[PDB]
Amino acid sequence: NDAQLKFANDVESRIQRRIEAILSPIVGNGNVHAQVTAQLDFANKEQTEEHYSPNGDASKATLRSRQLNISEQVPRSTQRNETSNYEVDRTIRHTKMNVGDIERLSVAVVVNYKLPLTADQMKQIEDLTREAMGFSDKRGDTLNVVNSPFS
Amino acid sequence: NDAQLKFANDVESRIQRRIEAILSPIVGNGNVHAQVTAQLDFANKEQTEEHYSPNGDASKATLRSRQLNISEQVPRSTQRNETSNYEVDRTIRHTKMNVGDIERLSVAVVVNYKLPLTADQMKQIEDLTREAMGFSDKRGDTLNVVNSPFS
Amino acid sequence: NDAQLKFANDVESRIQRRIEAILSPIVGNGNVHAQVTAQLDFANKEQTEEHYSPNGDASKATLRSRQLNISEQVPRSTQRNETSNYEVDRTIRHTKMNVGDIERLSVAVVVNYKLPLTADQMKQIEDLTREAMGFSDKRGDTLNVVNSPFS
Amino acid sequence: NDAQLKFANDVESRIQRRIEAILSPIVGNGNVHAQVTAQLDFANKEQTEEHYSPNGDASKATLRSRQLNISEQVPRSTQRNETSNYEVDRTIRHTKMNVGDIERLSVAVVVNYKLPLTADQMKQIEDLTREAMGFSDKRGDTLNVVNSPFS
Amino acid sequence: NDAQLKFANDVESRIQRRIEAILSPIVGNGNVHAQVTAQLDFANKEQTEEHYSPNGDASKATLRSRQLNISEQVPRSTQRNETSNYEVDRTIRHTKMNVGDIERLSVAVVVNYKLPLTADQMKQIEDLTREAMGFSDKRGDTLNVVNSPFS
């Protein structure tokens, strides 16, 4: 359980070094700081699907057997007994999920002044950090980059 | 689990060296920096499909047995008892997926000035990096190449 | 599973040496650089097909047995009881796929100037590299060759 | 798995030495370079066919037994009960395919100038390389021979 | 293993020495070069045929038993019950194919000048090489003999 905090720090440290490695050529060697918060999924999760292809249409069903009796007397006594045995398409997936994936990333980046960086330069700083995190709106990641003078 | 972070770093390092090896002849030995973020699938995953070819059409069904009784009296008492046993085509795929594939790549590339590189030169830099990652819109890969003066 | 990265590097380095060996006589000993990205299939995959030839036509069906009773009274009471047992043609393919095949190749080639190479020379440089990769539109391979001055 | 790359290199090396051995007497000892890309099938594959000769025609069917009852009263009650047991011709092929065959060949040949070689001399250079490959349009082989001044 | 490439080289070397041994007396000791490409079948293959001679004709059928009841009343109630048991001719071929046969040969022959050889002399050079390969249009063999000055 204590090794899960060491693991989460290893995940955050690599994303942090990656952001400070792609922004240091732009703003300067020490004019950028990044902090990464990684929510990691440490739950053991097993799953087993079992899908069947629908055979409701006769032009795609696979019959194994079929007994079709059709009687008719003409006062029109009509009978139609039909027994059908099918062979069904079946996919069985079995996934044992990985323990230690990333549920969500929260990244805060501060860049020094030089004078406020133009909206153009800050627009591309956000898009590069967005690629250094592995940003994904599916995970609900959040990124905040502010420009303010250092101390 | 800690070996999965070393493995993901080995994947990113190779994609990164490959981008800096095909762009260094163009922009310069040290006028380009690349950072790769690889989302890897470490989940164990088995799958067993089992498809059957449809035999609803009589011109492609394979009969093993067939008992076709046809009675008829002529007041037209008509019977037609038909039992069919089929041999069915069957494919059975069993895939044990590989643990450690790439789900998604996020690559950020910064190239130095020389003056802003023309839109022609930057368009071919993007398409070369696109081939060095192994870019695939199926995986949802993202690539960001910006042109900004270094420090 | 890190030997799969060493294996994927052997695959890429052989395709790379093959491109720099067929273009070196044309453009020069060091006026070409190639980088290959190979997506390799490391999934264990079994498969067992089982096709049957259709015997719906009587001129190509193989009968093992046949009991054909045909009664007829003449008020025309007609009967026709027909049982048929068939011998069916059957193919059974069992394929154990190879672990380590190539799903897709992404090759990036840069060639030095000398002045921009004519569209004639660049069109044949692409066709040679296309043969050195083993390019196949079935795999969805991508190739990019750009002409730009080196450094 | 790595022995499959050494094997694929052995296949390509032999096709390459054979092309440079049949073109060296023509264009010169060092005025030709060839690169071969072999796609080898390393999948284990078994197959078991089982064909039956059709016996729908009575002039080629082989009867083991036959019970033919024919009743007839004359108001014309007619019966005809016919049971038939057949001996069927059967072929059973069992093929265990070879691991390491060639799926596809990609050969790129460059020949030096001397002045561009005439269309006559280049047409026969293509036909000899076509025979040194083992070229086959069934495998989808591709061959590219360009004439370009060396360096 | 790699022993199949050593075996295929042994097959090609013998066909090659045979071509250069029947053409050396004609064109000269070193005025001819041949390269042979052998596509060999290394698949294990068993086959079991089982043919039956048709006995539909009564003048060539072999009866073991026969019960022929023929009733007749004369209003003409006629019966004819005929049971037949046959002895059938049966051939059973079992072939275990040879591993290492030749599926296809591709031979390229170049002969020196002396002046272009007469179309008469080149027509008989092609027909001799055709006999030194073991040429067979069933296998789809290909032969290319060109006449061009050496170096």
Coordinates of N, CA and C in Angstrom, one line a residue, chain A residues 3 6-7 10-11 14 17-19 21-22 24-29 53 58-74 87-102 124 127-136 138-139 141, chain B residues 1-2 4-6 9 12 33-40 42-57 60 75-89 97 104-110 142-151:
Chain A
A3 N 3.9 1.1 -1.3 CA 4.5 1.0 -2.6 C 3.6 1.6 -3.7
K6 N 4.8 5.3 -3.8 CA 6.0 5.4 -4.6 C 5.8 5.2 -6.1
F7 N 4.9 4.3 -6.4 CA 4.6 4.1 -7.8 C 3.9 5.4 -8.4
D10 N 6.4 7.9 -9.1 CA 7.2 7.6 -10.3 C 6.5 8.0 -11.6
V11 N 5.1 7.8 -11.6 CA 4.3 8.2 -12.7 C 4.3 9.7 -12.9
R14 N 7.8 11.3 -14.1 CA 8.1 11.1 -15.5 C 7.4 12.1 -16.4
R17 N 9.1 15.5 -15.6 CA 10.4 15.7 -16.4 C 10.1 15.9 -17.9
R18 N 9.1 15.3 -18.4 CA 8.8 15.4 -19.8 C 8.3 16.8 -20.2
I19 N 7.5 17.4 -19.3 CA 7.0 18.8 -19.5 C 8.1 19.8 -19.4
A21 N 11.2 19.2 -20.0 CA 12.1 19.0 -21.1 C 11.7 19.5 -22.4
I22 N 10.4 19.7 -22.7 CA 9.9 20.2 -23.9 C 9.7 21.7 -23.8
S24 N 11.7 23.8 -21.6 CA 13.0 24.4 -21.3 C 13.6 25.0 -22.6
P25 N 13.6 24.4 -23.8 CA 14.2 25.1 -24.9 C 13.4 26.3 -25.3
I26 N 12.2 26.5 -24.9 CA 11.4 27.7 -25.3 C 11.6 28.8 -24.4
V27 N 11.1 28.6 -23.1 CA 11.1 29.7 -22.2 C 12.4 29.9 -21.4
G28 N 13.2 28.9 -21.3 CA 14.4 28.9 -20.6 C 14.6 27.7 -19.7
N29 N 15.9 27.5 -19.3 CA 16.3 26.3 -18.5 C 15.5 26.2 -17.2
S53 N -23.7 -13.4 -32.0 CA -24.3 -12.7 -33.1 C -25.8 -13.0 -33.3
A58 N -33.1 -14.8 -41.4 CA -32.9 -16.1 -42.0 C -31.8 -16.1 -43.0
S59 N -31.4 -15.0 -43.6 CA -30.3 -14.9 -44.5 C -28.9 -14.8 -43.9
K60 N -28.9 -15.0 -42.6 CA -27.6 -15.0 -41.9 C -27.6 -16.0 -40.7
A61 N -28.7 -16.7 -40.5 CA -28.7 -17.7 -39.5 C -28.0 -19.0 -40.0
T62 N -27.5 -19.8 -39.1 CA -26.8 -21.0 -39.4 C -27.6 -22.2 -38.8
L63 N -28.3 -22.9 -39.6 CA -29.1 -24.0 -39.2 C -28.2 -25.3 -39.0
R64 N -28.4 -26.0 -37.9 CA -27.8 -27.3 -37.7 C -28.8 -28.4 -38.1
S65 N -30.1 -28.2 -37.7 CA -31.2 -29.1 -38.0 C -32.4 -28.3 -38.4
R66 N -33.4 -28.9 -39.0 CA -34.6 -28.3 -39.3 C -35.6 -29.4 -39.7
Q67 N -36.8 -29.4 -39.0 CA -37.9 -30.3 -39.3 C -39.1 -29.4 -39.6
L68 N -39.4 -29.3 -40.9 CA -40.5 -28.4 -41.4 C -41.6 -29.3 -42.0
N69 N -42.6 -29.5 -41.2 CA -43.8 -30.2 -41.6 C -44.9 -29.2 -42.0
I70 N -45.5 -29.4 -43.2 CA -46.5 -28.5 -43.8 C -47.6 -29.4 -44.3
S71 N -48.7 -29.3 -43.5 CA -50.0 -30.0 -43.9 C -51.0 -29.0 -44.4
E72 N -51.9 -29.5 -45.2 CA -52.9 -28.6 -45.9 C -54.0 -29.4 -46.4
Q73 N -55.3 -29.0 -46.1 CA -56.5 -29.6 -46.6 C -57.4 -28.6 -47.0
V74 N -58.0 -28.7 -48.3 CA -59.0 -27.8 -48.8 C -60.2 -28.5 -49.1
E87 N -26.7 -23.0 -35.1 CA -25.3 -22.8 -34.6 C -25.1 -21.3 -34.6
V88 N -24.6 -20.8 -33.4 CA -24.6 -19.4 -33.2 C -23.1 -19.0 -33.1
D89 N -22.8 -17.8 -33.7 CA -21.5 -17.2 -33.6 C -21.3 -16.6 -32.2
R90 N -20.1 -16.9 -31.6 CA -19.9 -16.5 -30.2 C -18.5 -16.0 -30.1
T91 N -18.3 -14.8 -29.5 CA -17.0 -14.3 -29.1 C -17.0 -14.2 -27.6
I92 N -15.9 -14.7 -27.0 CA -15.6 -14.7 -25.6 C -14.3 -14.0 -25.3
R93 N -14.4 -12.7 -24.8 CA -13.3 -11.9 -24.4 C -13.1 -12.1 -22.9
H94 N -11.9 -12.2 -22.5 CA -11.5 -12.3 -21.1 C -10.4 -11.3 -20.8
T95 N -10.6 -10.2 -20.1 CA -9.7 -9.2 -19.8 C -9.4 -9.2 -18.3
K96 N -8.1 -9.3 -18.0 CA -7.6 -9.0 -16.6 C -6.9 -7.7 -16.6
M97 N -7.6 -6.7 -16.2 CA -7.1 -5.3 -16.3 C -5.8 -5.1 -15.5
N98 N -5.1 -4.1 -16.0 CA -3.8 -3.8 -15.4 C -3.9 -2.9 -14.1
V99 N -3.2 -3.3 -13.0 CA -3.3 -2.5 -11.8 C -2.2 -1.5 -11.8
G100 N -2.6 -0.2 -11.9 CA -1.7 0.9 -11.9 C -1.9 1.9 -13.1
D101 N -3.0 1.8 -13.7 CA -3.3 2.7 -14.8 C -3.6 4.1 -14.3
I102 N -3.7 5.0 -15.2 CA -4.0 6.4 -14.9 C -5.5 6.7 -15.1
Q124 N 0.8 28.1 -27.7 CA 1.6 26.9 -28.1 C 2.3 26.3 -26.9
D127 N -0.3 23.8 -25.8 CA -0.5 22.7 -26.7 C 0.7 21.7 -26.6
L128 N 1.9 22.2 -26.2 CA 3.0 21.3 -26.1 C 2.9 20.5 -24.7
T129 N 2.6 21.2 -23.6 CA 2.3 20.6 -22.4 C 1.2 19.6 -22.5
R130 N 0.2 19.9 -23.3 CA -0.9 19.0 -23.6 C -0.5 17.7 -24.2
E131 N 0.6 17.7 -25.0 CA 1.1 16.5 -25.6 C 2.1 15.8 -24.7
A132 N 2.8 16.6 -23.8 CA 3.7 15.9 -22.8 C 3.0 15.2 -21.7
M133 N 1.8 15.6 -21.4 CA 1.0 14.8 -20.4 C 0.5 13.5 -21.0
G134 N 0.1 13.6 -22.3 CA -0.8 12.5 -22.8 C -2.2 12.9 -22.5
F135 N -2.5 14.2 -22.7 CA -3.8 14.7 -22.3 C -4.9 14.0 -23.1
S136 N -6.0 13.7 -22.4 CA -7.2 13.0 -23.0 C -8.4 13.5 -22.3
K138 N -11.1 12.0 -22.4 CA -11.8 10.9 -21.9 C -11.6 10.6 -20.4
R139 N -10.3 10.8 -20.0 CA -10.0 10.6 -18.6 C -10.4 11.8 -17.8
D141 N -8.8 14.8 -17.9 CA -7.6 15.5 -17.5 C -7.8 17.0 -17.4
Chain B
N1 N 5.0 -4.0 -11.8 CA 4.3 -2.8 -12.1 C 5.3 -1.6 -12.3
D2 N 6.4 -1.7 -11.5 CA 7.5 -0.7 -11.8 C 8.3 -1.0 -13.0
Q4 N 6.8 -1.9 -15.7 CA 5.9 -1.3 -16.7 C 6.3 0.2 -17.0
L5 N 6.8 0.9 -16.0 CA 7.2 2.2 -16.3 C 8.6 2.3 -17.0
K6 N 9.5 1.3 -16.7 CA 10.7 1.2 -17.4 C 10.5 0.7 -18.8
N9 N 9.1 3.7 -20.8 CA 10.2 4.6 -21.1 C 11.1 4.1 -22.2
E12 N 9.1 5.0 -25.4 CA 9.2 6.4 -25.7 C 10.5 6.8 -26.2
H33 N 13.9 19.2 -30.5 CA 13.7 18.4 -29.3 C 12.3 17.8 -29.4
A34 N 12.2 16.5 -29.0 CA 11.0 15.7 -29.1 C 10.8 15.0 -27.8
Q35 N 9.5 15.0 -27.4 CA 9.1 14.2 -26.2 C 7.9 13.4 -26.6
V36 N 7.9 12.1 -26.2 CA 6.9 11.1 -26.6 C 6.2 10.6 -25.4
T37 N 4.9 10.6 -25.4 CA 4.0 10.0 -24.3 C 3.3 8.8 -24.9
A38 N 3.6 7.6 -24.4 CA 3.1 6.4 -24.9 C 2.1 5.8 -23.8
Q39 N 0.8 5.7 -24.2 CA -0.2 5.0 -23.4 C -0.2 3.6 -23.8
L40 N 0.3 2.7 -22.9 CA 0.5 1.3 -23.2 C -0.6 0.5 -22.6
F42 N -1.4 -2.7 -20.8 CA -0.8 -3.8 -20.0 C -1.8 -4.8 -19.5
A43 N -3.0 -4.8 -20.0 CA -4.0 -5.7 -19.5 C -3.9 -7.0 -20.3
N44 N -3.9 -8.1 -19.5 CA -4.0 -9.5 -20.1 C -5.4 -9.6 -20.8
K45 N -5.4 -10.2 -22.0 CA -6.6 -10.2 -22.7 C -6.6 -11.4 -23.7
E46 N -7.5 -12.4 -23.5 CA -7.8 -13.5 -24.4 C -9.1 -13.3 -25.1
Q47 N -9.2 -13.9 -26.2 CA -10.4 -13.8 -27.0 C -10.5 -15.1 -27.8
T48 N -11.8 -15.6 -28.0 CA -12.1 -16.8 -28.7 C -13.3 -16.5 -29.6
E49 N -13.1 -16.2 -30.8 CA -14.2 -16.1 -31.8 C -14.7 -17.5 -32.2
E50 N -15.8 -17.5 -32.9 CA -16.3 -18.8 -33.4 C -17.4 -18.5 -34.4
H51 N -17.0 -18.2 -35.6 CA -18.0 -17.8 -36.7 C -18.5 -19.0 -37.4
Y52 N -19.7 -19.0 -37.8 CA -20.4 -20.0 -38.7 C -20.8 -19.4 -40.0
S53 N -20.6 -20.1 -41.1 CA -21.1 -19.6 -42.3 C -22.6 -19.8 -42.4
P54 N -23.4 -18.8 -42.8 CA -24.8 -19.0 -42.9 C -25.2 -20.0 -44.1
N55 N -26.2 -20.8 -43.8 CA -26.6 -21.8 -44.8 C -28.1 -21.6 -45.1
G56 N -28.6 -20.4 -45.0 CA -30.0 -20.2 -45.3 C -30.4 -20.4 -46.7
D57 N -29.4 -20.2 -47.6 CA -29.6 -20.5 -49.0 C -29.3 -21.9 -49.4
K60 N -25.9 -23.2 -51.2 CA -24.7 -23.2 -50.5 C -24.7 -23.9 -49.2
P75 N -60.9 -30.6 -52.5 CA -60.5 -31.7 -51.7 C -59.0 -32.2 -52.0
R76 N -58.1 -31.3 -51.6 CA -56.7 -31.5 -51.9 C -55.9 -31.6 -50.6
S77 N -55.8 -32.8 -50.1 CA -55.0 -33.0 -48.8 C -53.6 -33.2 -49.2
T78 N -52.8 -32.2 -48.8 CA -51.4 -32.1 -49.2 C -50.5 -32.1 -47.9
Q79 N -49.5 -33.0 -47.9 CA -48.5 -33.0 -46.8 C -47.1 -32.9 -47.4
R80 N -46.2 -32.4 -46.6 CA -44.8 -32.2 -47.0 C -43.9 -32.2 -45.7
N81 N -43.4 -33.3 -45.3 CA -42.6 -33.4 -44.2 C -41.1 -33.5 -44.6
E82 N -40.3 -32.5 -44.1 CA -38.9 -32.4 -44.6 C -38.0 -32.2 -43.4
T83 N -37.2 -33.2 -43.1 CA -36.2 -33.1 -42.1 C -34.8 -33.0 -42.7
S84 N -34.0 -32.0 -42.3 CA -32.7 -31.7 -42.8 C -31.6 -31.6 -41.7
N85 N -30.5 -32.3 -41.9 CA -29.4 -32.2 -41.1 C -28.2 -31.6 -41.9
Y86 N -27.6 -30.5 -41.4 CA -26.6 -29.8 -42.1 C -25.2 -30.0 -41.5
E87 N -24.2 -29.9 -42.4 CA -22.8 -29.7 -42.0 C -22.5 -28.3 -42.2
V88 N -22.0 -27.6 -41.2 CA -21.8 -26.2 -41.2 C -20.3 -25.8 -41.2
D89 N -20.0 -24.8 -42.0 CA -18.6 -24.3 -42.0 C -18.4 -23.5 -40.7
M97 N -3.9 -11.8 -26.7 CA -3.3 -10.5 -27.1 C -1.9 -10.3 -26.4
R104 N -1.9 4.7 -27.6 CA -2.0 6.1 -28.1 C -0.6 6.7 -27.9
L105 N -0.2 7.5 -28.9 CA 1.0 8.3 -28.8 C 0.7 9.7 -28.8
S106 N 1.4 10.5 -28.0 CA 1.4 11.9 -27.9 C 2.8 12.4 -28.1
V107 N 3.1 13.1 -29.1 CA 4.4 13.6 -29.5 C 4.4 15.1 -29.6
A108 N 5.4 15.8 -28.9 CA 5.6 17.2 -29.0 C 7.0 17.5 -29.5
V109 N 7.1 18.2 -30.6 CA 8.3 18.5 -31.2 C 8.5 20.0 -31.3
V110 N 9.6 20.5 -30.9 CA 10.0 21.9 -31.0 C 11.2 22.0 -31.9
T142 N -1.7 12.0 -31.4 CA -1.7 13.4 -31.5 C -0.2 13.9 -31.6
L143 N 0.0 14.8 -32.5 CA 1.3 15.3 -32.8 C 1.3 16.9 -32.8
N144 N 2.2 17.5 -32.1 CA 2.2 19.0 -32.1 C 3.7 19.4 -32.4
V145 N 3.9 20.1 -33.5 CA 5.2 20.7 -33.8 C 5.0 22.2 -33.9
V146 N 5.8 22.8 -33.0 CA 5.8 24.3 -33.0 C 7.2 24.8 -33.4
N147 N 7.3 26.0 -33.9 CA 8.5 26.6 -34.3 C 8.7 27.9 -33.4
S148 N 9.7 27.8 -32.5 CA 10.0 28.9 -31.6 C 11.5 29.1 -31.4
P149 N 12.0 30.3 -31.2 CA 13.4 30.4 -30.9 C 13.9 29.8 -29.6
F150 N 15.0 29.2 -29.6 CA 15.5 28.5 -28.4 C 16.2 29.5 -27.4
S151 N 17.0 29.0 -26.5 CA 17.6 29.8 -25.5 C 19.0 29.4 -25.3

